[PDB]
Design a protein around this nucleic acid. Structure first.
Lengths: 119, 193, 153, 104, 45, 70
RNA sequence: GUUAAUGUAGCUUAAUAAAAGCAAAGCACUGAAAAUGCUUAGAUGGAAUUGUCCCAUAAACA
């Protein structure tokens, strides 16, 4: 029953989300975040974290995305955040690495689409 | 004060060096993919022609194979660039020097630079100047002295009098350090290619 | 004209989002609404890089990671800090200590035993039904000798 | 203080692909050096067999910049590819619409 | 270096198989070129 | 059709080739930068000795180009 | 030695809670370039406190 922002019609992406998944691919590493509308990060999975680095081969990779997504999902399940909003760009959505990452989250049980609000 | 000008001539390399093995294998890779993308006895005659090329001598990629010692010759190197470099004797010094000539403030660097081209080589060499900006200036004292190092490129060269009594040597980089010990003369590499 | 122009949409987006975070004069939406470990770390990395099998799996895009190993290592390194975020996010530090914040350091573990075959864990923010919490839960938190404790639920 | 004119480069080579491959390389080197390339036009076949010639336009040079550029071109040349440097001699709605305001 | 741009690949979406041949110049230099038939050598007259 | 081992060999040498070119580009880029700085250093040196000569020299040569040489 | 440069990776007054971001490179995609996708290489040669020494060691003097 909580409010989701419904405006920003002229801007992309829409802000009608309780939670959002932000995936940033830098030169080194690749980071995935879950952030509330108020701007506080709740669950963060990054390739710059010691534990993930030792078990991976390269900071940036297609499998990396997959692996960090699986790690992110378990933390997301751990935090109890089951429903989330993902807003990829057209090329990013088509990117194979991001497609695989979404598959990991779907397999993990994290729903990439939030349910409609109750009025 | 002693006013002295000089020129660092450049001769382009005519023929390339051989490809590295990694470069060779990549040529196979671009060829094999080309075959993959390709769209579907004269050979004996071509075989006869290829051996006709083999028997016929082509100019070597490097023209040192016969020479091995022709520093005085213009065609000292073909794989890399050359620099004119002539033994000179000064009033208080006897050093292996870059070509030098006497310059005046009225004469611009190119005018002296042009005179350097033919004054010390006395040949029908063809060289070009791109910018009037000089490339090196070095001062050696015993009495104050300064030498201006210019840069030029050899368009072509008909080097007459190959066997001069002078010790003109064309050096790319190997003989620069060997013959020019002091930095004032061994730092020519800084503006050399 | 001197400055270069963004050649891709993403560059502007990354610049824009970073730009939004910075405070500004104009009103905006946001206002109203050790060394040895480093050396050892590096050495392990080099060994991982050397391993040809790691390269082959990565280029074959079949590699994977063990989640359990990462989780335990994550607990040692920065689990305290991430746990603090959840506590602040969930309001524990404001409702419990009237705004005082304490970083959790003891890797506390709790799970509700369902029968005897399996036991439901209690992580941060987890969902557990009251039926599952009928009986008291097993607690193991790796105290070490001495250092008396008090547990409060 | 004077600014170089825009100098066209006609790259003439037996093979179109090699001419294109050299044409791109100078462009990327030009782009890395911040040299603007307005056009990459292609000449017709040199019927006699034929050869293929490709233009890489280069606009803007400096005395020091020109010297450092050209010798690099000599080095970049694979050999057997013939260089050339020569001084050079429809509008859409936004361009016309702006153009009216200037003279109106 | 002349080898900087020497190694290059075709930019054609469709083309028959190209065969390597060398063109002999009057100064003796040689160039690797692509020809439609499996010839071995070419000579500049 | 290539076997996975055949692709593996070609891909492996491709990785070496990509690394080699990156090494080649980095060396050349610094080499060009150094030469220009030396030319700029050469510009500075005679300015100390005589800046007046540069007033004529710093001007570009309009007649230098066109220049053709393969 | 006098003068005087100099010790995060091209750049940064990134960082001591976790050695970062940016710049930069290759292949694929065909007008070129760019974009996009897949890939690549690296660090403190240092102590200092803010928001200079002292070494490696560069030189003019020497």
């Amino acid at each position: 029953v909580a409010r989701k922002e419904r405006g920003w019609a002229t801007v992309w992406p829409n802000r009608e989300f309780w939670h959002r998944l932000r995936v940033v691919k830098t030169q080194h590493h690749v980071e995935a975040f879950v952030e509330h509308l108020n701007g506080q990060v709740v669950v963060s999975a990054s390739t710059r974290e010691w534990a993930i680095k030792k078990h991976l081969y390269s900071t940036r990779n297609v499998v990396a995305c997959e692996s960090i997504g699986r790690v992110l999902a378990q933390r997301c399940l751990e935090a109890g955040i089951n429903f989330m909003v993902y807003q990829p760009t057209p090329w990013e959505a088509s990117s194979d690495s991001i497609k695989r990452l979404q598959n990991a989250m779907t397999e993990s049980g994290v729903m990439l689409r939030e349910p409609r609000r109750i009025y | 004060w002693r006013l002295s000008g000089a020129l660092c001539l450049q001769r382009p390399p005519l023929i390339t060096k051989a490809l590295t093995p990694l470069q060779e294998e990549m040529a196979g890779l671009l060829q094999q993919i080309e075959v993959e993308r390709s769209l579907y006895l004269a050979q004996d005659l071509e075989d006869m022609w290829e051996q006709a090329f083999l028997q016929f001598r082509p100019g070597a990629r490097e023209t040192e194979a016969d020479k091995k010692n022709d520093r005085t010759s213009l065609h000292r190197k073909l794989d890399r660039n050359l620099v004119l470099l002539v033994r000179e004797k000064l009033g208080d010094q006897d050093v292996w020097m870059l070509p030098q000539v006497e310059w005046q403030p009225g004469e611009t660097l190119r005018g002296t630079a042009e005179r350097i081209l033919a004054t010390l080589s006395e040949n029908n060499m063809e060289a070009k100047f791109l910018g009037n900006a000089p490339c090196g200036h070095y001062k050696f004292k015993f009495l104050g002295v300064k030498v201006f190092f210019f840069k030029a490129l050899l368009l072509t060269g008909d080097f007459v009098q190959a066997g001069k009594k002078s010790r003109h040597v064309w050096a790319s980089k190997e003989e620069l350090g060997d013959y020019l010990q002091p930095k004032y003369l061994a730092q020519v590499r800084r503006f050399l290619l | 004209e001197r400055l270069e122009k963004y050649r891709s949409f993403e560059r502007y987006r990354r610049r824009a989002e970073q730009e939004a975070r910075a405070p500004h004069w104009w009103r905006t939406y946001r206002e109203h609404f050790r060394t040895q470990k480093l050396l050892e770390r590096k050495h392990f990395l080099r060994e991982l890089r050397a391993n040809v099998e790691e390269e082959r799996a990565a280029r074959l895009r079949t590699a994977s990671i063990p989640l359990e190993a990462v989780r335990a290592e994550w607990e040692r390194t920065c689990g305290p800090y991430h746990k603090q975020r959840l506590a602040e996010y969930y309001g524990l530090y404001r409702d419990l200590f009237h705004g005082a914040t304490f970083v959790p350091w003891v890797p506390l573990h709790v799970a509700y035993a369902v029968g005897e075959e399996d036991l439901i864990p209690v992580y941060h923010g987890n969902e557990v039904t009251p039926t599952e919490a009928s009986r008291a839960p097993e607690v193991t938190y790796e105290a070490d000798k001495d250092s008396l404790w008090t547990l409060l639920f | 203080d004077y600014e170089y004119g825009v100098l066209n480069i006609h790259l003439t080579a037996y093979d179109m692909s090699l001419a294109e491959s050299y044409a791109q390389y100078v462009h990327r080197l030009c782009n890395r050096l911040s040299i603007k390339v307005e056009e990459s036009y292609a000449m017709p076949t040199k019927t006699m067999l034929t050869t293929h010639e490709r233009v890489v336009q280069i606009s803007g040079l400096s005395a020091t910049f020109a010297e450092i550029f050209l010798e690099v071109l000599q080095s970049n040349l694979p050999e057997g590819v013939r260089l050339s440097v020569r001084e050079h001699t429809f509008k859409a709605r936004p361009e016309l619409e702006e153009l009216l305001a200037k003279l109106n | 270096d002349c080898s900087r741009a020497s190694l290059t690949r075709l930019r054609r979406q469709a083309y028959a198989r190209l065969y390597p041949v060398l063109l002999v110049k009057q100064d003796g230099s040689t160039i690797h070129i692509r020809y439609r038939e499996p010839r071995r050598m070419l000579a500049m007259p | 059709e290539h076997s996975p081992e055949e692709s593996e060999r070609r891909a492996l040498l491709l990785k070496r080739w990509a690394l080699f070119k990156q090494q080649e580009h980095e060396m050349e880029r610094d080499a060009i930068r150094s030469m220009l700085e030396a030319q700029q250093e050469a510009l500075e040196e005679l300015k100390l000795e005589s800046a007046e000569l540069y007033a004529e020299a710093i001007k570009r040569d309009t007649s230098l180009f066109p220049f053709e040489k393969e």
